[PDB]
Amino acid sequence: GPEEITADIPNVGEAALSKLDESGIVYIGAEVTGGDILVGKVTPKGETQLTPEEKLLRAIFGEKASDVKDSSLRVPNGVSGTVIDVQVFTRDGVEKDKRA
Amino acid sequence: ERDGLFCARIFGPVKDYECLCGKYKRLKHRGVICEKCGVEVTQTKVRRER
Amino acid sequence: VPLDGGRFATSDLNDLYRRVINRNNRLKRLLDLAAPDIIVRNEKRMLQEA
Amino acid sequence: RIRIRLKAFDHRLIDQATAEIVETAKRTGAQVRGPIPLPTRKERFTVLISPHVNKDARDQYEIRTHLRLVDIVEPTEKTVDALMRLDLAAGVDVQISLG
Amino acid sequence: KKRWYVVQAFSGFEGRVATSLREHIKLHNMEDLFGEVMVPTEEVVEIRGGQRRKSERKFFPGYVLVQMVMNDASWHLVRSVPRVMGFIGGTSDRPAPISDKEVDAIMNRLQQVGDKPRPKTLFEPGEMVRVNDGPFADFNGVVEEVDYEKSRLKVSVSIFGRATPVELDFSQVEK
DNA sequence: TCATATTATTACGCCAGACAGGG
DNA sequence: CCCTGTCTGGCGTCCTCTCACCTATGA
Numbered sequence: 001g002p003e004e005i006t007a008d009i010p011n012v013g014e015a016a017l018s019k020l021d022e023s024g025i026v027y028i029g030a031e032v033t034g035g036d037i038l039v040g041k042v043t044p045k046g047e048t049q050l051t052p053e054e055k056l057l058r059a060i061f062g063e064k065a066s067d068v069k070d071s072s073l074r075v076p077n078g079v080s081g082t083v084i085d086v087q088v089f090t091r092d093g094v095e096k097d098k099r100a
Numbered sequence: 101e102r103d104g105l106f107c108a109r110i111f112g113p114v115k116d117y118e119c120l121c122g123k124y125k126r127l128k129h130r131g132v133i134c135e136k137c138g139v140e141v142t143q144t145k146v147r148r149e150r
Numbered sequence: 151v152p153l154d155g156g157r158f159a160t161s162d163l164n165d166l167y168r169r170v171i172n173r174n175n176r177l178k179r180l181l182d183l184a185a186p187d188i189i190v191r192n193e194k195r196m197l198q199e200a
Numbered sequence: 201r202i203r204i205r206l207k208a209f210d211h212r213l214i215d216q217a218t219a220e221i222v223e224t225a226k227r228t229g230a231q232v233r234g235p236i237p238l239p240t241r242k243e244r245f246t247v248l249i250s251p252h253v254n255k256d257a258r259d260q261y262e263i264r265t266h267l268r269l270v271d272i273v274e275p276t277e278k279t280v281d282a283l284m285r286l287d288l289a290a291g292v293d294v295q296i297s298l299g
Numbered sequence: 300k301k302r303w304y305v306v307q308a309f310s311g312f313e314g315r316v317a318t319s320l321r322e323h324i325k326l327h328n329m330e331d332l333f334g335e336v337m338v339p340t341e342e343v344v345e346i347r348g349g350q351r352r353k354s355e356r357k358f359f360p361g362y363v364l365v366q367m368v369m370n371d372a373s374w375h376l377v378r379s380v381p382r383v384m385g386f387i388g389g390t391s392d393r394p395a396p397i398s399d400k401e402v403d404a405i406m407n408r409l410q411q412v413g414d415k416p417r418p419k420t421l422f423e424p425g426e427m428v429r430v431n432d433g434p435f436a437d438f439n440g441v442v443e444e445v446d447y448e449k450s451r452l453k454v455s456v457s458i459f460g461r462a463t464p465v466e467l468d469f470s471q472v473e474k
Numbered sequence: 475t476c477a478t479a480t481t482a483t484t485a486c487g488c489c490a491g492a493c494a495g496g497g
Numbered sequence: 498c499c500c501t502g503t504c505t506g507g508c509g510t511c512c513t514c515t516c517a518c519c520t521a522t523g524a
Binding site: 202275277280281283284285287294295296297298 | 456460461
């Protein structure tokens with residue numbers, strides 16, 4: 001399947017996601033450090049060993065991703081900064097999310 | 101594609117102990133080769149030497 | 151190598167081996183179906199040059 | 201078109217399966233036909249419950265085999281293959297058939 | 300008397316080379332110096348077949364056969380036809396015609412194109428067939444059943460665990 | 475999408491090493 | 498047959514950093 005830019009992201013907690021909005025993209029103005037998350041991005045994994053819970057979770061939300069593989073964009077290790085401008089370009093047909 | 105330049109039954113599996121067809125993945129089940137794709141479930145380092 | 155654009159800009163070796171295997175398979179088929187000898191001379195010249 | 205015949209003894213389970221397969225279809229492809237319920241087979245059985253003799257003493261059992269007919273009108277590249285990895289819950293015999 | 304010669308074209312533009320060659324003949328009106336032009340024949344698709352459609356038939360590997368005579372004017376004519384490399388022979392001064400003793404045996408083989416042939420084949424369950432047509436294309440499986448009376452090999456998508464048993468034609472799937 | 479298979483520029487500077495030509 | 502122009506191949510500095518750009522065809 002395609003990828004996800006949304007902020008419902010595995011393996012992360014409050015301390016990473018406090019600097020993102022409700023749709024993955026960092027704010028305009030958030031002064032970040034070297035190694036935070038700017039854009040949250042997760043790619044498909046798979047069910048493989050679909051267990052009773054895994055099979056029940058693949059028919060309750062109606063989504064098949066599920067845990068996903070973190071591939072979020074990060075600030076390269078060493079540089080600080082202040083996010084001044086965010087561009088979002090969308091290939092036509094794709095659902096625009098709330099920040100686009 | 102079997103059996104072109106990049107192969108699996110000539111040169112070995114792409115993933116370690118990961119048979120192309122997939123049937124052997126036990127620690128007490130090593131040495132036996134595959135029957136479907138006939139890929140000896142071994143290591144991918146052997147695609148550097150065959 | 152992938153170039154992260156859906157395509158593989160291949161290395162030169164796979165291109166060369168692919169040319170040898172194309173020309174060799176066409177020469178096996180032309181020696182199979184009894185081609186006239188001028189054409190299989192030309193085909194062997196092409197294989198030698200590949 | 202891909203006709204899909206779900207068969208199971210538990211009806212709730214079969215329902216769950218059907219919904220699952222619909223979900224599978226609908227994200228990848230488009231225009232899923234729908235989950236059509238066919239008639240249930242109520243295969244009954246009578247048996248003598250006594251060791252030796254009492255013929256009016258009986259237990260009547262039955263097995264309710266439920267049928268669910270799901271159809272897919274447009275088989276795309278992505279959709280059909282999606283089912284390969286997508287196995288359904290145990291105790292539900294599925295039967296896909298394209299054309 | 301017009302003898303045969305072999306022309307090399309850019310492989311893939313061969314029908315367009317043949318058409319441009321006929322047109323250059325009827326432009327420079329050396330009509331008495333060219334007989335025919337033979338291209339991509341002896342079709343067979345893949346295996347067997349008794350219906351139409353199918354297509355994807357090709358034997359000519361890039362060579363164009365020309366009934367011709369040899370003057371240097373006609374030689375310059377054929378090499379001035381576009382997308383033509385040159386003749387294939389012993390030398391480039393006097394290029395080589397092919398034969399005539401192997402034309403008698405080739406004539407009998409061309410007359411038996413469709414009269415009485417099509418030899419039978421066989422198959423077995425192992426290890427697995429290949430599907431390249433319909434939604435099952437790009438998938439492999441095994442033939443649990445092989446109806447030789449209906450010419451239909453029963454092969455299941457064989458999904459890791461429990462797949463579904465479908466029927467594919469011999470040409471629809473590959474061994 | 476899945477096999478088909480190669481043509482219309484020149485403008486370095488020695489320095490060895492092999493080759494046909496000729497007194 | 499021993500000089501000889503002439504032609505063909507084979508060299509030509511290490512280390513690092515930034516950027517862009519990547520085969521056509523096709524019933």
